[model samples]
Every structure is written in structure tokens, then in C-alpha cells.
Target: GSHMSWVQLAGSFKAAGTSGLILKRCSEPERYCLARLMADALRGCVPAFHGVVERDGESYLQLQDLLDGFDGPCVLDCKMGVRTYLEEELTKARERPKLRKDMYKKMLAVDPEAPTEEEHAQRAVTKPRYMQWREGISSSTTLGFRIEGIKKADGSCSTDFKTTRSREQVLRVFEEFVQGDEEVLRRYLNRLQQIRDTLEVSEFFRRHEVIGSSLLFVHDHCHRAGVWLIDFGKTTPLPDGQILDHRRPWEEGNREDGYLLGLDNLIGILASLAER
Candidate 1:
């Protein structure tokens, strides 16, 4: 769904796949890993997971029909790439010059910062659903997570979210089919181990594959920042050769360094809330 379609590509959405979603296992080995790893969310329903092809010859990747989020729980399709400066120049070249110039000019009347490239990191924009997320966060000052008020299911951010639940329930979703409190975080580390396991087999994938690297500000139904995931896609693979990346291997501790970072944040909030 990240890529667009021909009509949109041919027009404004411009192959952005904005309106429709592409379903089924991805074709390339890398993308296919994501779809296959998380079939419930990624597999195409074409007869038997064969995958349907779509446009300007339907583009290069595969496509299929999604049942509709209205069919089940709402699914968020977020691309959590790293937000660092290491790739600024490379990103700029990938973004194209003329397009940025055109967008900047269009943005002028709003502020003298038309284009706002240097100021806005030169990325394009339009007030999006995420803007609502920003509103909820901006309104609150929580230490660990903004856990700020939601727009209401109808969250403080968007009509998509509503009430609240225990931090325990949200944490379980991140772990699921597993038991215990800390286990949820272990589930995430397990996926990491999956990739690490393949180091000798898929060195290219492990050495790179910046999936699960982004910090997700999970909202518990919208009211508070809840826990989320046991998945692929937002991966953060480690550098080659660190056989076991140190954290207890499910025996002594069973957590990864990245998640350990969050453990501190939660401790912060825990300590913080005692005051409240």
C-alpha cells in the first residue's frame, strides 16, 4: 500500500496507492519475508495466495483485495523508517528536485516558508491523519509517553480511537499466545532472533533490514499510549557477528537492548505516576 497506483500515478495520487490497498505476499524476497512472516496482515486472498497483479502495467509489485478494516479491528499501516540524519543527502536525491520546488511554491501563501525544505527537512506534506496524532501529543506533557488524551473513538486525535483499557491488555497484544508480563517484550525480541538466526543464511537481510527500528507511540484505544506488536516490517536488525546480542536469552532476562530502553521509560512513568 505504500506504493501508489497508475490512475493516481497517472493523476494526482500518482501511483501512490492512496485509495486502494495492495494485498498478498510481496514479490521481492525482502518484502515477501514481511508478508510471509505476518500472513494474517500481508497475504493476498487471490484464490490461494497466488497474488494479483495491478497497473501502469499495474506497477511491479503484486496486488489483491483487502476485506476492509471495517471487517475487523482497525489496522494501522505505518512505515516506521529511522528518523536520523545519516541518509539526508541520499534521501534528497531520491526525492527529486522539481517536485520539491513545485510543492514549496504551492505552500507559499500559508507561510513565507514556502517549500520549507531546509526548515521542514525538505520532505513534502499535507495535513494527514498523523497530524491528529500530533495534536494529542502536543496537548499533553507526559514524561515517558504522551499518554495524552485521545480525540475520542472519536479520539483526542481521530475519530478512529475511543476509550481506555489496562496497560496489561495492551501489552499482551504485543506478546500474544504467550504468557506473562515481560514475555510480550520477549515476543518482539524473538522476531529479532529470527532474523539473527538467519545471519549465516541471510546476511544481506540481517546486516540491513531496518525494520521495527522506529518507536511506536501505541495508543490504548486512544486514551493512553498502549503496547503494540509481535511482527515484522518495523524491524531493527543488528550488525553482523554479534551471535547473541547480550540481553538474557529468555532464561536470565530475555529482553533486547532496544526494548530495555523502553523498560526505563516505563519505569520513569511508573515512578512519575506514583506522584500523580
Candidate 2:
């Protein structure tokens, strides 16, 4: 009874035959290597990477389908980090500046007064400028994480939380996602705690910048719930003698991404939600 539909919340994945596998359009080559290396490191907390495959002159990354066991899975995609763009990206943008009028229009759509006099006159901004502004517009800047999107088991999807910044607001979204199912909520909290415990000791986590990575949360009608760390496209390794404090706020010189800070705040929010 496995029926394929175009109803998936995310459009980047396609089912791989009937083997409980999925095909994602490949990103950077380093991301492919990182996924393979982290497959064993994160184990049960990440989707299994089954090497890359070529199809129709395009390459795809094979991964264990996180939605496999669930008939109607409710999903949440939370981008975890204080900043989504990498420090390297900032350096590159500074070295070779390119003005993006599209991002200027985006900024104007949200808040016309957000741009400076020079930016308004030019009607454009650099990549780093746009990225920093994007973060500040969302909860990622203040809360250390932001909900990207959510799909209910009923197949309805919502992106209303894109600019939601308050912890109370996010808690409300979580409550709505589970429909007040305390059992599922508790299970999610436990899984997040387990992930946090593992993250504290994982060497893979310690060495990587982990920019733009996401915590993919899934649950189904059966109340089967799981959470996985997905996306490693910008997870860059630090240089020798330098380690990132994932809890510290990002400064110009200090390469902090605040991945753990996001987790801690998420765990705290869920814990409080569970108690209520």
C-alpha cells in the first residue's frame, strides 16, 4: 500500500523504488563525504547514507527515508544555528562583493526602513549583508533556531512561523503540531535530550561549524516519533587548535554558530510545554 504522491512538504526528495530509500539532489562534494563519515558517527540519530548514485545525467545522494515507517507523518524542519551562512561565505563576500537587488526587494517587502541610506539609494546589498538581515528577521538571530516549516499528518503545511521569534510563540506552534498529544510531546523531548547528550561527546560535532543544518522532526498517526540531524552542506571543519563553542553567540572574529544554544533553548521550551 505504498502510494507515491507529490504531497511531501519538501520538494528536494524523491522515493527510491520500494526499498525504503530516498534520493536527494546532491549538494557539494564535501557534503557528500561529510554525510558518509557522519553516518556511523551519529548512527541512529541521522539517516543512513548509502553512497551517491547517478540518474539521468544527474547525481543523487541516497539516504534512508526518515518518513518510511510512518503512514502519515507530521514533519517539522527547524534550521538550527545562530547564523545560517558560513564565516567563509562572509569572507568571500567581503573579498568579491556582488550586489543583489532581489534581496533588496525582499528586505523592502518585510520592512522598508530596514535598509540604510546607501542601501536604499543603490537598492541592493551584498550577500553577507542580506544573510545577516535575514537572520535578524527570523528567530534564528535571537532564539538561536527558527522553524522553517511544518507539515501536519493531514497533509496541510504551514510556514507562518518563518518570522516567529518568541519562545512563547514557538511553544504554541509545537502544541499545535502535536495537537496537544502529551505522549508524543514527551517522546520528542526525550529524543531531543538523547541527541543533546550525544552531541556533547561527538567528535564530528566538535570539529564542524554546522551552518544551515536542520533538526528534522517526524511523527505519525501511530504516535511513532523521531528526530534527526540533517543537512551538512555548510558544516565546515575548524583549523588546528581552534574549537567552536556551539553555545556562544557569533562575533566577527570568534567562529561560533550556537548550535547547542539552539538545542538547549528548544529543550527548555519543550520541557516547559510538557509541564503545562
Candidate 3:
């Protein structure tokens, strides 16, 4: 896993930092294993940039020059193109007949009999190609938060790249999104209902939990332009022979009864969109 693999680097970063915190608390070997799996899943999403790179005793993903245009904080400038490209690729992968067949076969190999609703639900929740943030990294831990050989842009401060978020801040973003726009509010409420129906019928929602989180982020930034789901640092692959539910913390709220963004919300949004 990407998270597990980077534990050593994370630790080193923390030790060097003044605050002595930044990487977040997580077991080393486990995070490493999880990180490798995530990198595999991300291979088709982002452009093939260099593997995790180390410089001046710190590490960072070697993002491609394609991201140069995304230097600013504007959501439109940074997220729209990346999000669209990722969705297209993911759709293509899912629609591949051979890939679907292989996935089904793998499911059957785990359970000879037709999968029960409970079993199917478990699979759906646990079978995502990526891992949860808390799965390998602790939210409270901190890393050195340094970048070497990456000079700051002219007139920019060092604090520009401090990518830290509090739990409250994340929830606040969601709350604002759900309450802000009339049209989007309707869409989200309907999508949540639809998810419940889909769960009851097919034993899964169309998108994974992490993807759902990403969608929430998209919705929050939608008015501006778009949102990207980058940084798969804590992602992990579905284990080869495992049957355990591992949903992210945010997803717990999604399963609640009377959740706003059900199926009907989604349909309403789709209906409002312009015809091709």
C-alpha cells in the first residue's frame, strides 16, 4: 500500500521538522503494503509520472508538467480537467466486458453459491480498488512538510503547499455543499435515496465509498468549476483473499436512513442536465 510504503519517509520528514509531527500516526510495514496497492490502482488515472521521488531526505509524488497549469488555488484551473479525465478512464475500465467477467469470476471463487444480500453488500463496501485514509495513516500525525528542489514560485510563500485539513473543516465543506445550491441540493438528496435503492437491489452503490467522498468534494467545488480527486497516498488494493468491510469514516453517515442524496436526488440532477 502507498501509505504503508511511505512510513519511513514520513517518519524521516517528521523527525526533521520543528514541530516533530506531520506524517500522521500509522504502522510502517502495513502502510507500505497498502501504498503499493494504491499506486497500482492509480496507474490508469493520473498520467504516468515518476514513482515516489526522494529529495533532500524528503519524498513527494513526481507530478507531471501537465499539472503546471494547475499552479493556482482556483478549482477551475486545477481540478476540472483532471477529474473529467479520471472519470472517463474509470468508466472505460468498468465497462470492459473482459474485466467485468474476471471480476465476477473472482467473486464466485470466493463464494460458490449465489452471493447473499449481506455478502454482496460486504463485498461492495470492501472491494474497492483503493483503501481508506484512516486505514494506513493517522489523522493526528504530522510530517515535516518540506519540498526540496521545488522552488517556490515568485511572490509565493512557503505556506502555499501546506496540505493539512482538520476534521471539522472537512465536515464544514460538506455541510456548505449540501445547503448551498438549490439545484445541487436536489441532486444530492436524490442521489442518496438512489444509493439506498441500489444497495437493496444490486447490493452496492454505483460508486465506491472513497469515490463518494470525492464526489462530495466535487459538489462542494462545482460552482467554481470542478474538483479533482488526487493524492492516493493512503490507498490500498483489495486484498487477494479477504472478506472484511473497510469503509471510510465519512461513509458511515452515507448509510444513515433519510440521507439526503438518494436515488431521486441523482435522477433530478440528470434530468436537469442538457441533452447531448
TM-score of each: 0.31, 0.91, 0.27
Q: Model 1, 125: alpha-carbon shift in Å? A: 9.7
For 16-62, candidate 1 gives per-residue lDDT tens digits of: 14344544333354354444533432122111233434554542333
Query: Where is the poorest 10-residue window by lDDT in model 1?
Result: 139-148
For residues 1-276, write the lDDT of model 2, one tens digit per residue: 111342543255666764777787888844454564665456678887877788779877888788777768888999999988877778877888788999899888888899999999999988778878878878788889999998765557787765688899888888888888887898999999999998887777777788888999888778888899988777877788578769987897787999999999999999999988
Stronger candidate by TM-score (2 vs 3): 2
lDDT of 3: 0.29
- Residue 212 lDDT in model 1? 31
Clashes of each: 33, 0, 39
RMSD of each: 12.2, 2.3, 18.2
Q: What is the lDDT of residue 216 in candidate 1?
A: 26
Q: Which stretches of candidate 1 lie over 4 Å from their true place?
A: 1-71, 84-205, 211-276
The most accurate candidate by TM-score is 2
- 1-276 per-residue lDDT for model 3 (tens digits): 122222332242222121211332233433443244345433323333433544566564433332233232111111110011123233444665122334444455534454456545554322222212211121111210111111112222222221223333323333433344555445444544444343333211212222222222123334221222333332223333322122211223332211123223323433443121
